[PDB]
Design a protein around this ligand. Structure first.
Ligand SMILES: *[C@@H]1O[C@H](CO)[C@@H](O)[C@H](O)[C@H]1NC(C)=O
Ligand SMILES: *[C@@H]1O[C@H](CO)[C@@H](O)[C@H](O)[C@H]1NC(C)=O
Ligand SMILES: *[C@@H]1O[C@H](CO)[C@@H](O)[C@H](O)[C@H]1NC(C)=O
Ligand SMILES: *[C@@H]1O[C@H](CO)[C@@H](O)[C@H](O)[C@H]1NC(C)=O
Ligand SMILES: *[C@@H]1O[C@H](CO)[C@@H](O)[C@H](O)[C@H]1NC(C)=O
Lengths: 151, 44, 126, 108, 98
């Protein structure tokens, strides 16, 4: 009876942290817009996507509200913490010092940004994302911060 | 040549289960499926 | 110094297809996207599309999706606009244009949406 | 797609504005807004880009502005050389570029 | 009966913040037994592990983890060290501090 009402709806977790090759060396309208658009075009909407990730676009209901708010804070802070330990705490587009490994993806760069969407990219890089994060954390950010502290 | 760039706010999602809460239109405090302790919905 | 040379005007019966070339020089071909726009007589200017010459990836206006194919030849530095299923409403001057800046992928697209250098344009009559 | 006045006019030496109205996703949310000039029978040229910037070769009399979801081009000191069709351009919400309908400017 | 199983287990609170004198102006807790400096090249592995019978107890544990993380982030911000991991604060060492 409830499926007949919820048939239109799917619950998805937003993964606002993406990694992609570039040429760098270091309102809620449109909230998930450009999801079906290619990358690049979907990189110009980061401001609206980054916002509303903290607030959004009967004991039982109160506990579900508490679980929802704690979970939202937990995920928001996991993403902001990842940005912090990467040295990206408030840049929104954070260029890094990790060279791109062709073993992760070799799509001539133009295909990633002009044809490929962020969803397709996330599906293709899901097996490497943990390696990319490891290099962002263990190698370049703590080494960069130590080097900046070698006064 | 190419370097890793971190983008926060990419329109990416994955199928996931999560605890959902309730919202209601205005407020009967004695309703079985109580709408008190629910957040009001947006006017639009 | 930007030189954009387009093919001559073509007459086409409704339902025919036309290929409009735009050869370019004065800049590195693969560093800049090629844009196409449509200026119909007696009315305003409509955007047709763009092609990333360094990979050949294209975008089209919603009105032009499924009717227009844009390709590029990196050996002759020439971009081709193929218009299919022409109708009477497709009579227009078709211009090619060079954007103001090279596109910095994933970082800075500000220079892709500004048409800095314009070609002469060519008529398509239906 | 993009709303633009059909025509504007004023006497020589007066200051006028040409409006451009899109939605939040096209003009309000992006600063990549530009203006173009087509003299009758001539190749289009860039007037304004990025709301406030001018290319080399265009005099300072052309001053762009944007507020809310509405952009405008201010032309202070109309000359007979400026009698041209003015067009507004902006980024569309996703992967697209939208143009206005064209404003015919005349000098009275 | 449980002590005889928990004899080798101890719960410890992780204190990711610390201070050390400098001249300036291993998935989790690995290199803890290594000397300092060498252990400063394994700081993000501990930071990444922060924020990792009754639902109220689980929520109290998660809110406590969030509060401890944010207390440490508040300490970094209030010191002007937000998001730096290694931050030189220009406060002199008072010599009596070891
Ligand atoms: C690239 O990836 C391969 C396989 O994961 C690895 O062996 C290699 O060391 C990586 N290259 C660099 C430069 O880190
Ligand atoms: C771009 O992606 C789409 C996804 O359906 C694919 O069909 C298309 O061929 C790709 N473009 C090129 C030029 O390969
Ligand atoms: C990731 O690894 C799994 C291992 O089973 C494999 O099936 C999958 O195709 C891999 N994905 C990519 C994108 O390489
Ligand atoms: C433990 O001490 C030995 C002493 O030789 C040293 O070689 C080793 O690297 C130390 N372990 C760590 C994790 O630092
Ligand atoms: C150490 O701190 C005390 C105050 O607690 C101060 O009086 C003393 O001078 C300091 N010592 C040095 C060496 O700065």
């Amino acid at each position: 009876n409830w499926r007949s009402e919820l048939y239109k709806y799917k619950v998805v977790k937003i993964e606002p942290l993406g990694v992609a090759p570039t040429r760098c060396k270091r309102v809620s309208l449109g909230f998930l817009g450009a999801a079906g658009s290619t990358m690049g075009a979907a990189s110009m909407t980061l401001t609206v996507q980054a916002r509303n990730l903290l607030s959004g676009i009967d004991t039982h209901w109160g506990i579900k509200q508490l679980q929802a708010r704690v979970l939202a804070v937990e995920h928001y802070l996991r993403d902001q913490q990842l940005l912090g330990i990467w040295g990206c705490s408030g840049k929104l587009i954070c260029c890094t010092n990790v060279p791109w490994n062709s073993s992760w993806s070799n799509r001539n760069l133009s295909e990633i940004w002009d044809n490929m969407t962020w969803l397709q990219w996330d599906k293709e890089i899901s097996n490497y994302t943990q390696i990319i994060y490891g290099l962002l954390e263990e190698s370049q950010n703590q080494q960069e911060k130590n080097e900046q502290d070698l006064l | 040549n190419l370097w890793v760039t971190v983008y926060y706010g990419v329109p990416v999602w994955k199928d996931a289960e999560t605890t959902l809460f309730c919202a209601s239109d205005a407020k009967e405090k004695h309703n079985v499926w109580a709408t008190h302790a629910c957040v009001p919905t947006d006017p639009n | 110094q930007v030189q954009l040379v387009q093919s001559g005007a073509e007459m086409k019966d409704p339902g025919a297809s036309v290929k409009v070339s735009c050869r370019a020089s004065g800049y590195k071909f693969t560093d800049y996207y090629m844009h196409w726009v449509r200026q119909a007589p007696g009315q305003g200017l409509e955007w047709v599309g763009w092609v990333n010459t360094n990979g050949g990836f294209t975008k089209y206006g919603a009105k032009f999706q499924g009717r227009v194919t844009v390709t590029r030849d990196t050996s002759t530095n020439t971009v081709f606009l193929e218009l299919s299923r022409l109708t009477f409403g497709d009579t227009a001057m078709y211009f090619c244009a060079r954007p103001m800046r090279p596109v910095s992928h994933g970082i800075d697209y500000s220079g892709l949406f500004v048409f800095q250098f314009w070609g002469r344009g060519t008529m398509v009559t239906v | 797609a993009l709303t633009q006045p059909a025509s504007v006019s004023a006497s020589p030496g007066q200051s006028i504005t040409i409006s451009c109205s899109g939605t939040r996703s096209d003009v309000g949310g992006y600063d990549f807004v530009s203006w173009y000039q087509q003299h009758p029978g001539k190749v289009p040229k860039l007037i304004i880009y990025e709301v406030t910037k001018r290319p080399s070769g265009i005099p300072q009399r052309f001053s762009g502005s944007k507020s809310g979801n509405t952009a405008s081009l201010t032309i202070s000191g109309l000359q007979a050389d400026d009698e041209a069709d003015y067009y507004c351009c902006s980024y569309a919400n996703y992967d697209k570029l939208i143009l206005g309908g064209g404003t015919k400017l005349t000098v009275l």
